Structure formats: C-alpha cells, structure tokens
Amino acid sequence: RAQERLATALQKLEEAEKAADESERGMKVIENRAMKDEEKMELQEMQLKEAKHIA
Amino acid sequence: RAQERLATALQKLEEAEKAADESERGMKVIENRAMKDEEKMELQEMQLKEAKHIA
Amino acid sequence: TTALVCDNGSGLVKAGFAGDDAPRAVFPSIVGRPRHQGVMVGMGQKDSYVGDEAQSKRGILTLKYPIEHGIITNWDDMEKIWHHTFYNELRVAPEEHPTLLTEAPLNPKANREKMTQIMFETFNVPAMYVAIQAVLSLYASGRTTGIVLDSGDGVTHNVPIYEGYALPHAIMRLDLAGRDLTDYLMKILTERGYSFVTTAEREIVRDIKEKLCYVALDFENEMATAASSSSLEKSYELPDGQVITIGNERFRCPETLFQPSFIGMESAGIHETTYNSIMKCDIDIRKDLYANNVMSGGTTMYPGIADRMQKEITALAPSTMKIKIIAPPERKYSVWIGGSILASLSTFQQMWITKQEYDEAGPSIVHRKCF
Amino acid sequence: KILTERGYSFVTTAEREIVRDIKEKLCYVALDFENEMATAASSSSLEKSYELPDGQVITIGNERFRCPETLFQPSFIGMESAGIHETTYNSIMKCDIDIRKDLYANNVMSGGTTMYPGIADRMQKEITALAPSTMKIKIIAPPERKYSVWIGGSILASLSTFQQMWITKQEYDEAGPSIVHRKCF
Amino acid sequence: TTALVCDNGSGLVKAGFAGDDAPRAVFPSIVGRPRHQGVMVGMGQKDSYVGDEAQSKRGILTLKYPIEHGIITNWDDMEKIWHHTFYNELRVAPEEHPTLLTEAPLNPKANREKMTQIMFETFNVPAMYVAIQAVLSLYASGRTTGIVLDSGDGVTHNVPIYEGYALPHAIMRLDLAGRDLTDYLMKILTERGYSFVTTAEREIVRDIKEKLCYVALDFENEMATAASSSSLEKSYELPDGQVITIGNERFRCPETLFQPSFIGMESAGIHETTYNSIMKCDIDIRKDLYANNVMSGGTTMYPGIADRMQKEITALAPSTMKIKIIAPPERKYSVWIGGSILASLSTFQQMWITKQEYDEAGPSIVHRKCF
Ligand SMILES: Nc1ncnc2c1ncn2[C@@H]1O[C@H](COP(=O)(O)OP(=O)(O)O)[C@@H](O)[C@H]1O
Ligand SMILES: Nc1ncnc2c1ncn2[C@@H]1O[C@H](COP(=O)(O)OP(=O)(O)O)[C@@H](O)[C@H]1O
C-alpha cells in the first residue's frame, strides 16, 4: 500500500501542478487583460472628461 | 521514505491547489472587471457621441 | 397534490414545492418598519414591509430578524413572514398543501409546538411535519452515514448518522453562526475607521463578508504575510461610493469559527466539536464518520473552509484514518433539497400530521412519533 | 441537555456549576417513572422555581425526576450498560450462593450521588422485583453517607493493627513505585 | 522623575503631574483663527490662538475642535494643542517626563499609532503609554469591579470590568455625547425664536446647557407639567444682555441620551446599552456589575441623571437585584484622577514604552502588549 499511495501521490501531484500551470498562465493572461482594462478605462475616462467639458 | 515523500506530495498538492484557486478567484473578479470596463467604454464613448452631437 | 417545503432558518427563507430541484423563492427573513414619520399624504405607505421589499427599503426602516438562534422570538413577525411567503412568493392557497418545516436540534419544545399550532389554525394546512435540518442535509447528499455539519445564520449543529440511525446523545449544538461573524466583522472594521451601527448597514457588512472574507489555511502565516506585504488588501464599493479597503480582516473574521475566543465565547472550535462528536459515537462507526464529513449551510461557504477543516480534523484524528469532507458547490440549499426529496417520497406520505389528528390530540401531538 | 427544551441554555464551564446546584436542590428519584410522568403531564404540583445568580427565576417540572432517572435507564444518555439496580443484582448473583441472603440484607449506599430524595425506596423496589420473594431486601442509607468514605478512612487509619501496613519512605526508596501493587497495597 | 498625565478628550484638555490630586491646567481643546482681515498695523496679531485664549477671542475667530468622536482628525491642530499645553499650561520640558495618554475604546489604530509617533518625534518624550479612559475612571473610584459608563463630549462607552479583568467583547461604544446634545439644543432653541449658528455662539449654547438643563425623572409627567404650569421656566442673560427664557427645553435636551431617536440615531438609550452590556457578561458576575454602575465624564453631570438612570435600569433588571449608581461629585475629572493614580504606581514603572524600544520597533509597538 505504501507503493500504491506513493504512485497516486506522485501522479496526482504532477497533474495538479499542471492544473496550477494552466491556472497560472491563465492568471498571466488575465493580468495582461487587467492592464488592458486599466489603459482602456484610462483612455475612455479621459475622453469622457473632454466630452463633458466640450459639451 | 515513502511516507515522508508522501507528506511532501500532500503539502505541495494542497498549497498548489490553494494557489490555483486564489488565482481562480482573481480570474473571476478580473473577468467581471473586464466586462465592467467594457460597458464603461460603451457608455462613455456614447456620452462622447451625444456630446459631439449637441456640440 | 404537491407538498410545500418551507425552510425557515435565520437570515434566509427558502420555499418551494416538493419534487422541484431548487427552492423557487428565496428572500431575507426580515421585517422592517418605518422609523420616520412620512409627510407625503396619498402615498399610502404600508406599516411594515417584509422580505426583499424591506431589503430594498432599508434606508428608512428598522429591520428585525424574528428568529434569533433557531428559536422564534417574535411570533407576529413570523406569521407575517409565512403569510407573505405563501400568498406572494409562491402564490398558492395553503389550505390544500401539506407543508414541511425544519428546525435545528435541541430547541425549546414550545417553539415547535406553537409552530404546529399556528400552521394548523391561522393558515389551516391539511397536514404538516417538522424535520431536523441535518437529516435533510444528509438526504440531499445521497449519503446514509456520516456526520453533517450544518451552519446556517443562527446556529451550528453536528449530527452523526449511521445507516439512517441517529445518535442523539452525540448531537452538538453551538450558537456561533453567520450573524455572530457579521457582528465581529462590524466590530473589527472600526479599527480602520469604518463605523457601521445601523441595522441597515449591518446588511452592507454582511455583503462585505460574503464577498471578501475567506478562511486561512494557516492563521499565523497569513497574519505575518498581511503584515509584510499588501497582496491581501481588496477594495469594496459602498452604496454611496467611498470605496473602502480591508486586509487582515478578510481572514480574521471567519477565523472565529475555529477560535471562538475572539468573540468571548468559551466553547471549542468547529473542528474540535466535530471531533468530539465523532469520539462520542461508538468505536465501530468512527472510520465512516471520518470519511463522510458532510457540510451544509451558507456559513460553510467560505473560500478555503473545507481545506482548513480537513487540516485541523486530520491533526486531531489518528494518522491511519482517511479524512474526507463532502462540500458540494450548492451546499447552501442542501437542507431545502433534502426536504424536497423526502417530501416527494410515498413511504413518507403516512408520516404527516393530519388536521383531524391535530384536532383530536392538540399541539402535544408533535413530540409524539408523529414527529 | 434536557434543560434546553424549556429555553434555558447553560454552556459555560462556570454555569455547569449552576446546573449542579439545581440538580442537588430540586432533583429526586421517582418511585414509579410512568406514573410520575403522567402526573406531571396532568397537574402542575411538581413545578418548582429557582433563582439564578442574577435573578431571572426559572422553573423546572418533569426534569426534576427525569434527570436522576438515568441511573436506572442509562439509555437516556446513550450508554448501553444496565441500570444501577440491575448491576447490583448481577453482582449479587456472581457471588457464591451461600452468601446471597446477607448481601440482600446489607445493601450499603454511599457517595454524594446516592443522596437523592427517594433513591433508596426506588432502589429497594427494583431490586426486590428482581430478587426472589422469600429474601429480605434492605438498604443501609445513613444520613451522612456522603462522607462515609472519609469516615471509614479515618477509622482505619486510626487503628494500630494498621500501623504496619503503611509504605515507608525507606521501603519505597528500596523498591521503587512498583511497591504499591505488592501487598504493601 | 515625575510623570505627566494629559487626558485629551474632546471639548476639554486636562493635564497635570502624576501623584497630584487634580489636573493643574484645564482649558477647552479648540483652535481658533481670525476670519476677518484686521486693519491696525503693529498690532502683530498671531495667526492661530488656542485654548482659553481662543475661548476669549471667540468674537472674531472660527473655532474647530481637532477631535470629533474620540478620534483625531486635524493632526496639526492637535500638535498645536499639545505644544501649547506643555509649554504654557505646565511650563515643563517634555524631554524628561514620561507622559500618559488616554483614548476611548474601539478607535482607529492609526489614531493611537500616529499619537505615539508624534509624541516620540516632535516632543521627544523619554517614554509614554496609552490607557483606556474607563479603566482609569475605575481606578479613581477605588473599585476593582463594576461597569463604568464614561460619557465625555464626543463618545460614550461602557466597559464592564470584574476583579481587574476586562471583558472586551461586551464593551459598548456609542457616538452620542455632549457635542450632540449641544447641537440638538441649538436646534430646538429655534422654536422659541433664538437662533445660534456661529461656531462662537455654539459655546454660548454649551454654557446654557451646562447651567439650565437637567434630566427628568419621568418624561411624560414633566412634559404635561411644563404644559400646564410655568414653574419650570428659567431665564438666562446672553453676553449682550437680552435675557432669554427656556422651559420644556431644559429637560428635553438631555432626554436624548435615553431616546436617541430625537436626533435621528437608531441605537438604544443609555440605560439600554448599559443593561445590554451587563447581559452580554457572564451570569456569575452580573450582580456585582448591577451593584457598581460607575459614572464619569462631564455629560453625566446633569442634575437628576443618576436617579433616572437607576429608575430605568431597575425597570429592566430583575426585581431581586440591588441596583446602585456610583456617581461621585467630582466625576468630571475621574479619568485624570485615575490616570495620576496609575502613573504614580511603581509596579507600573515597567509598563512604559521607552524611546529606545520605540526606535527599535517603530510605532507598531503600541498595539503590542506595551499597550
Ligand atoms: N458566500 C458566502 N460566504 C460566507 N458566508 C455566507 C456566504 N453566503 C451566505 N453566507 C452566510 O450564510 C447565511 C445564510 O445561511 P443559511 O443556510 O441561509 O442560514 P439558515 O439555514 O439559517 O437560513 C447568511 O446569513 C450569510 O451571512
Ligand atoms: N454641569 C454640566 N451639565 C451637563 N453637561 C456638562 C456639564 N459640565 C460639562 N458638561 C459637558 O461635558 C463635556 C465635558 O466632558 P469631558 O469629560 O471634558 O469630555 P472629554 O472626556 O471628551 O474631555 C462638555 O463638553 C460639556 O458639554
């Protein structure tokens, strides 16, 4: 049984590491999109201001 | 050594899962924020439009 | 005809029809009354709102949950709640519908009795029945053994069941639940400068708790971390702007469930009461109970609670025992789901309490095996 | 536990002492459980009040004899073993047959838990129902029995034929704590 | 050497040396600045008066209490206050004097932190310490148990203490105090035609309150009486003659403390928060707490407040409990007195926060048990 749960711990360990790797390049792309939303909100907020002023 | 490496696998699995899931909470909230900034851009470019209209 | 399944609880009323897959109507179990005088004649303001109506009119009301810790204190507000449920949320004449009702274990018998009496007199149901929330929660999980840890908004009980048999002497009720966590959060939120005192803004604090809080896998490490870095701070928008930020609080608040000393209580933590309830049962059924720790109720919906719970109860139990924690993703409604399942049986259709039988034997009938 | 079903909740280790006082004052054994249950159901001549350390008097009825009844029906607390009377009778029956009459006649009773109003009478009734009919059942229940252990201890220690059963410091130094199990008992 | 005891509070700063019997210097904690321009050259008018100087120059200034509800908001005015205290009210070099500071419970931790930091940097004390006003108020009354109801000018808290132990989970802070009563009096004084709007004449109203108001043992009877007769009207002469009269107001104003609804607040009255704080405490210590309701702070100096308070809290408590209200005749300074007592101890002389220790550990040291 030691060999059994060793093998299980091993495999499940690496697959959960791979799942974390999926979630973490996902977190990389989502923080990239976070900065995307930062710059988009910045630009659009600026143009909102100039719109209000000109109006 | 089976049980010691098994304990290593357990703690690693667990902390990696918690990291994956906190990044998952982060991805939830950033998808939310992304849609948020999306409709933000929509409405504020729109008020820019009507500002240009009446301008 | 179909039966109704109204799970009162504190904080949230959950009603629906037996056999459905989820409670149809869900609304906060509060009653509000205006606390100013009103000046616009012809507005015809009613005198007491209820449910989501009150939750929306919060700004000018004073809200009062009519259930404190599983027990019903204001009976008139409770009757208002029930009447509003039946006639607006479900829009159903309760005269031709057996209704299922739930209550925590170890409650004042007068509570259950008066519940039965009001049900049969005011609303005049054809039949009714009162069930233990934890048994229903086990039903909804497809199990037949295992201890269940329900933790709603007012109370928190453990019920060990094995092969459908309950061990009553090992039931552990504990009066620490979501309302207490909300209050402790209101308290520790002062030390940043935020002051919520009104019964209205207690709801704001409840929302903050449901959104930002989480359980820490290791309290000391998270404390030291939040001290060093600032990667734990998150912001929040109040109903009038003025975004606020909370750090340490996010995991200090629900930590109470494991260290009740934070709010001055003396009883042991959640993991401790669970383990004790296990140890009270006979030795032959302890492995299965270790394997089948069900969890229900809205308070068990914190990000990370199952992992911390497993860690602790593993630290307490022997090493050669497999600890598992059954935490479904819809566990908030597990009690109502189990109630629907049970009421949908036919081997159950002879356990109801018939109006005639009540008229024959009085409210004392409930404690009898017409349970 | 059973005080909850009236609305009274004591959970603190402090107020466990309050509950112990309530038990020592109001509880009592009932000669016939079913009759007393039916009686408490019908009338209210059994309710007695009690003032807590902050006023707010409480009242208990059925509990007064539900609580100490456990000793005769341990199932109330989930234990499986037999009741007090039953274990007494069994202990009798395990003894040799020639000494059972005297044991029937000399049921001594001590300790503070045997200080309930009525416990001796119920005890006698039960153990009489178990034993044969031609045996005399008696129950020695002194009024100071709560201290009978200490009293007997003083009596024994005051003997002189006992002054050679002690365990001397020198002897223990010579033979280690294993000496106790030896006939230096 | 001697220790300093500065009890900031709102409304009134009171300072003195440890071991003394009463605070040497007592002056209003306000800062004034001229709001006109001034035309006489060579007059050399300074730019901001402080304390009694400002209270005398009221006519041409704009006064601004730098403490709102126990919390410090304008830190520069607070530093001005402290500096003026040390260098003019006491004529003492603060470099060689450990100072004792007070604050209400449940305050922003940043407040106390910045307090410590400024104390060690600007004034450069050798050591200091921050104490809870209510604990000191208990010290000054020779007690060691009993709940204390401090109510200064900005905040109002109850702190149940037993045998020298404090039960923090039962502390009840409430943000209704003398300033709010002053404002409510300013408001209801309009309905006689008297209009006070300036920050100067707010002080006039404060004096009117301190002189003519009182608590009514029974509100309805006193209302009906003032309606029928006129034996309750008393007059008062403003700083320019034009005597005024007030009737109903005399007891309508301080009644707020028992019916906070008068000013739109939702919390329960003073007696109610007291009784609730009692009930939150363990049952074994409730009789002593009932018997030792200490009071302090200037707001508890209304003629009749102790009798009304006893009446109410007796109506709430069981009948077989002895209610007593310890209301000394000097209770306004009980906090400072207790502070002097404590600072004068020697078993206390190792609880200070040494400047070396602070330099070693930074302002975060205060929350640490160097409390
Ligand atoms: N996502 C969440 N995280 C933490 N706590 C929650 C969450 N959702 C709800 N709660 C808490 O759970 C309570 C609802 O639990 P519920 O099962 O409805 O109680 P009851 O059974 O008494 O109705 C709410 O009062 C809320 O404070
Ligand atoms: N005789 C009195 N009657 C009623 N209220 C008073 C009286 N004297 C002072 N006060 C009020 O009490 C306040 C002073 O309380 P104090 O203990 O100085 O508060 P703090 O502790 O915040 O300095 C003043 O603002 C005043 O309004």
From Swiss-Prot, chains A, B:
Q: Which domain of life is it from?
A: Eukaryota
> Which parts of the sequence are annotated with region: Disordered?
17-36
Where can this protein be found? Cytoplasm, Cytoskeleton
Phosphothreonine modification sites are 8
Q: List the disulfide bonds.
A: none
Q: Where are the transmembrane segments?
A: none
Family as reported in the entry's similarity comment: Belongs to the tropomyosin family.
What does the subunit comment say? Homodimer. Heterodimer of an alpha (TPM1, TPM3 or TPM4) and a beta (TPM2) chain.
Reported function: Binds to actin filaments in muscle and non-muscle cells. Plays a central role, in association with the troponin complex, in the calcium dependent regulation of vertebrate striated muscle contraction. Smooth muscle contraction is regulated by interaction with caldesmon. In non-muscle cells is implicated in stabilizing cytoskeleton actin filaments. The non-muscle isoform may have a role in agonist-mediated receptor internalization.
Comment, domains:
The molecule is in a coiled coil structure that is formed by 2 polypeptide chains. The sequence exhibits a prominent seven-residues periodicity.
Protein's UniProt name: Tropomyosin beta chain
- Mind giving the lineage of the organism this protein is from? Eukaryota, Metazoa, Chordata, Craniata, Vertebrata
Which residues of the whole protein does the chain here span? 101 to 155 of 284
Swiss-Prot record, chain D:
Region labeled Interaction with alpha-actinin — which residues? Answer: 168-180
The entry's localization annotation reads: Cytoplasm, Cytoskeleton
Tell me what PTMs the record reports for this protein.
MICAL1 and MICAL2 produce the (R)-S-oxide form. The (R)-S-oxide form is reverted by MSRB1 and MSRB2, which promotes actin repolymerization. Demethylation by ALKBH4 is required for maintaining actomyosin dynamics supporting normal cleavage furrow ingression during cytokinesis and cell migration.
- Subunit composition and interactions: Polymerization of globular actin (G-actin) leads to a structural filament (F-actin) in the form of a two-stranded helix. Each actin can bind to 4 others. Interacts with alpha-actinin. Identified in a complex composed of ACTA1, COBL, GSN AND TMSB4X. Interacts with TTID. Interacts (via its C-terminus) with USP25.
Q: Miscellaneous notes for this chain?
A: In vertebrates 3 main groups of actin isoforms, alpha, beta and gamma have been identified. The alpha actins are found in muscle tissues and are a major constituent of the contractile apparatus. The beta and gamma actins coexist in most cell types as components of the cytoskeleton and as mediators of internal cell motility.
State the function annotated in the UniProt record: Actins are highly conserved proteins that are involved in various types of cell motility and are ubiquitously expressed in all eukaryotic cells.
So what family is this one in? Belongs to the actin family.
Q: What is this protein called?
A: Actin, alpha skeletal muscle
Q: Which organism is it from?
A: Rattus norvegicus (Rat)
- Full-protein residues shown here are 193 to 377 of 377
